[PDB]
XYZ file of C-alpha atoms in Angstrom:
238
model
C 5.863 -19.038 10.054
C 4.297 -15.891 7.880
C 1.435 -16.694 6.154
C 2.497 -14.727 2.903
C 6.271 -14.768 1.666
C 5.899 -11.178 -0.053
C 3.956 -8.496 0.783
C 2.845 -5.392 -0.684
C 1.567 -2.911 1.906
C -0.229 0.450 0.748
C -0.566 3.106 2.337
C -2.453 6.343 2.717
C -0.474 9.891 2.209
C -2.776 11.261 4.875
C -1.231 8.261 7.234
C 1.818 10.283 7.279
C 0.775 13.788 8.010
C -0.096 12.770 11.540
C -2.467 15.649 13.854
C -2.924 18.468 11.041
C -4.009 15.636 8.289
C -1.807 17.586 5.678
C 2.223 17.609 5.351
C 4.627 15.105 6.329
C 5.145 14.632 10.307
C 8.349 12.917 10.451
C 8.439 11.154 13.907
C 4.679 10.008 12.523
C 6.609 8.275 9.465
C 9.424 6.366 12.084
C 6.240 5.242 14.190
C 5.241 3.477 10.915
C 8.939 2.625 9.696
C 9.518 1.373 12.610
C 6.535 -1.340 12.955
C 7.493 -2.728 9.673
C 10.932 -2.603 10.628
C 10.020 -4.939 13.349
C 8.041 -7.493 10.442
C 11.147 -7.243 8.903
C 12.603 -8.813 11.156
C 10.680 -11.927 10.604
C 11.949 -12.749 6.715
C 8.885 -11.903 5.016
C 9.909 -9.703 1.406
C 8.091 -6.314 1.392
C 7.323 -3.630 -0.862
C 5.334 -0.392 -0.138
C 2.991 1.820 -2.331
C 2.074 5.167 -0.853
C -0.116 8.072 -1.544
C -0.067 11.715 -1.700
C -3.344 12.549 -0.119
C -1.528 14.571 2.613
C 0.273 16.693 0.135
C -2.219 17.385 -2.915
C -5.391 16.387 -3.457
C -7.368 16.315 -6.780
C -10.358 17.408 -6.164
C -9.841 21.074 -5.162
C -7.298 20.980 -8.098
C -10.247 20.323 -10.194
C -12.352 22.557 -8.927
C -10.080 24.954 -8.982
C -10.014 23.735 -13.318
C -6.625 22.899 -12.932
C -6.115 20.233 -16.179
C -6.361 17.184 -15.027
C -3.254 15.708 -16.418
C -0.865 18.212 -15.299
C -2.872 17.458 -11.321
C -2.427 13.765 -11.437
C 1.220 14.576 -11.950
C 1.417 16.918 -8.897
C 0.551 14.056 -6.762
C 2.673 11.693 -8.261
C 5.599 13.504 -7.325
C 4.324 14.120 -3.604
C 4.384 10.555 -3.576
C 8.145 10.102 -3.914
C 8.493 12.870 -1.238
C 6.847 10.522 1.178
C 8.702 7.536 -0.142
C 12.133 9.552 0.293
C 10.898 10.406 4.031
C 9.516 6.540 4.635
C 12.988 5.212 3.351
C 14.850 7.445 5.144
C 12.686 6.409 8.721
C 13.173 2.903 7.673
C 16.977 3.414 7.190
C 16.701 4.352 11.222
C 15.974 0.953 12.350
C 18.565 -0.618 10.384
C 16.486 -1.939 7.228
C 18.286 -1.608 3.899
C 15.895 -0.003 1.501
C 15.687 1.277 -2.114
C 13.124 3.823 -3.283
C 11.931 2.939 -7.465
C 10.025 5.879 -9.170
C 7.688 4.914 -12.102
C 8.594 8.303 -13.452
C 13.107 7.704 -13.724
C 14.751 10.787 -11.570
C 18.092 9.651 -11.936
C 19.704 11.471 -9.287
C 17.214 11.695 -6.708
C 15.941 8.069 -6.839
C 16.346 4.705 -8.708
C 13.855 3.976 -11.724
C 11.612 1.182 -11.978
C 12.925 -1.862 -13.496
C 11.171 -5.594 -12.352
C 14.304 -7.188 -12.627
C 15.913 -5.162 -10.417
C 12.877 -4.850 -7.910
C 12.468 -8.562 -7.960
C 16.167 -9.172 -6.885
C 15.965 -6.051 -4.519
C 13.848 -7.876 -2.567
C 15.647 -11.187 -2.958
C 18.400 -9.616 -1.129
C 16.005 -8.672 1.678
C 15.652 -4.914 1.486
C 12.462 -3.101 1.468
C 11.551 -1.702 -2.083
C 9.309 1.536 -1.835
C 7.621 2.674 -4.698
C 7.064 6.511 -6.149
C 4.848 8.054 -8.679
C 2.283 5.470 -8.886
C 2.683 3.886 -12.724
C 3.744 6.916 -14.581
C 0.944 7.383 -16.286
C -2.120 9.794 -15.566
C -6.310 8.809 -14.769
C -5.146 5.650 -12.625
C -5.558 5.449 -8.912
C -3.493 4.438 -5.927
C -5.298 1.074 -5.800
C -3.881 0.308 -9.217
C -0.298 1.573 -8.341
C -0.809 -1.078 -5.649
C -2.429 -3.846 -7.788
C 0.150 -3.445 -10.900
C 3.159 -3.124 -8.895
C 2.110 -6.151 -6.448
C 1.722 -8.563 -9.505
C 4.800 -7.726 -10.767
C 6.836 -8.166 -8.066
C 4.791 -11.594 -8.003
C 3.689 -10.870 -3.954
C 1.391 -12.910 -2.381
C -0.809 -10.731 -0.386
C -1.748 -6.660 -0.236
C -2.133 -5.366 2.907
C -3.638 -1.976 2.800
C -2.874 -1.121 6.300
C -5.770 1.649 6.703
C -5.339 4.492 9.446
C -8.460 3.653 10.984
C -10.929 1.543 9.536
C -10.471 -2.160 10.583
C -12.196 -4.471 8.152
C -14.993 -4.053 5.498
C -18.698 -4.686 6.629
C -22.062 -5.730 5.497
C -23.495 -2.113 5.644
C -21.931 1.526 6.390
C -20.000 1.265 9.805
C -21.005 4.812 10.032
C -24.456 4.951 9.535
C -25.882 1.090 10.654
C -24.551 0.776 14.340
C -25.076 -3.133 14.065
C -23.049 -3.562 11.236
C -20.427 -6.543 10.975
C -17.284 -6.922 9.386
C -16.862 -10.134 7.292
C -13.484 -12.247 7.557
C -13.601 -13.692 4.523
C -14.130 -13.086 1.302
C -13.544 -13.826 -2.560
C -12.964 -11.937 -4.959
C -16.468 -12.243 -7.118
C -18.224 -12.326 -3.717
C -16.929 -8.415 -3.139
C -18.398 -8.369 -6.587
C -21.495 -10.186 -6.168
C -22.350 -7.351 -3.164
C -21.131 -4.096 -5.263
C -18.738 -3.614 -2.223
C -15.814 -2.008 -4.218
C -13.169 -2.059 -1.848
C -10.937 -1.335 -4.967
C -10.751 0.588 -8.161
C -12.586 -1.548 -10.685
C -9.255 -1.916 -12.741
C -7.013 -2.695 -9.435
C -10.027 -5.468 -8.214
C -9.550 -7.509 -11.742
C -5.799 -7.187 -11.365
C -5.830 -8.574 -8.171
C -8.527 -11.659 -8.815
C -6.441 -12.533 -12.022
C -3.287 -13.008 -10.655
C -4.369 -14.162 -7.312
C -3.281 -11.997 -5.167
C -4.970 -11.611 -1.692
C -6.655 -7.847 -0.403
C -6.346 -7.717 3.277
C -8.139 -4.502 4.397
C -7.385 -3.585 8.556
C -6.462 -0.985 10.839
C -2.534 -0.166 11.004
C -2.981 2.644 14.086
C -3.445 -0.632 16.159
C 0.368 -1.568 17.652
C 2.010 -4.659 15.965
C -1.430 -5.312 14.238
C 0.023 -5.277 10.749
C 2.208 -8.243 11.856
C -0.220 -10.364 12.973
C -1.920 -9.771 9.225
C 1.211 -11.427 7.938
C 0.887 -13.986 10.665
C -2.776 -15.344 9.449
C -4.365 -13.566 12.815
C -8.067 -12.577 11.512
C -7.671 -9.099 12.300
C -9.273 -7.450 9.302
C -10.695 -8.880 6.387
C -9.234 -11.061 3.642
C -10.285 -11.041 -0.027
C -8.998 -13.892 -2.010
C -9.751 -16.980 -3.964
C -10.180 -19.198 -1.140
């Protein structure tokens, strides 16, 4: 008995590159495939939304007075390289899955289309996501956010590779500081705590869709998320 019916889980490009922090470390992407493959198993629709952090970053790029545009592509198309690789790992554990790319690539991977995505998932295969929306100056969070309330999904996990919750105060700096368990969407306003983007946080309260923030790197922790174990910490309407 899942607490959420359809989940969108984001994750970070750097989650895949494993040691170096950069790259894609294949057996790293199975450990991960592998632990969802296991949710899976438990009927509960899924969806993932990755990033490209461990194969181009923006910043340098801008630095470097790269335009800006022409960057923001870059990454989007790392981010279908780690959606190929995660589909792939998934494949390994038995877990029929279909790769959409908000940019259409014909050959190399299926285009984005709702209705199909909505019955994808209907059929109970994993739908991974590429390219964020398409469309440059959005971030990951809002890849996330749009795609989650299209496909109409009850909860986003964004299964972090190392953090475990969000607290009152910087975990790193204020050694007594607590994570809360629960909280609502104007609350995270009320306190400036911007787990989100701005754009992806209205998104999300709007169409009432739950932000469930905890670590992934813990074994079988991201199933006991979908379970209702307070793990990390939940962001919705009450």
């Amino acid at each position: 008995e899942p607490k959420y019916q359809r989940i969108l889980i984001k994750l970070s490009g750097e989650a895949l590159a494993g040691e170096k922090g950069v790259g894609i470390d294949i057996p790293t992407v199975q450990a991960i495939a592998k632990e969802i493959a296991e949710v899976h198993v438990s009927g509960v629709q899924i969806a993932l939304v990755i990033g490209g952090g461990n194969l181009w970053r923006g910043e340098p790029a801008a630095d470097a007075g790269m335009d800006r545009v022409q960057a923001d592509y870059t990454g989007m198309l790392g981010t279908v390289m780690n959606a190929l690789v995660m589909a792939d790992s998934l494949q390994h554990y038995g877990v029929d899955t279909r790769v959409q790319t908000a940019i259409p690539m014909q050959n190399v991977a299926e285009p984005y289309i709702r209705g199909r995505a909505l019955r994808h998932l209907e059929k109970n295969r994993i739908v991974v996501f590429g390219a964020g929306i398409g469309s440059p100056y959005f971030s990951t969070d809002t890849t996330a956010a749009l795609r989650a309330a299209e496909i109409e999904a009850d909860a986003i996990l964004m299964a972090k590779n190392g953090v475990d919750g969000v607290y009152n105060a910087d975990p790193k700096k204020d050694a007594n500081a607590v994570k809360f368990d629960e909280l609502t969407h104007g609350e995270v306003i009320k306190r400036g705590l911007k787990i989100m983007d701005a754009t992806a946080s209205t998104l999300s309260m709007d169409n009432d869709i739950d932000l469930v923030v905890f670590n992934m790197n813990e074994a079988g922790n991201i199933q006991r998320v979908v379970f209702g174990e307070h793990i990390g910490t939940t962001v919705s309407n009450k």
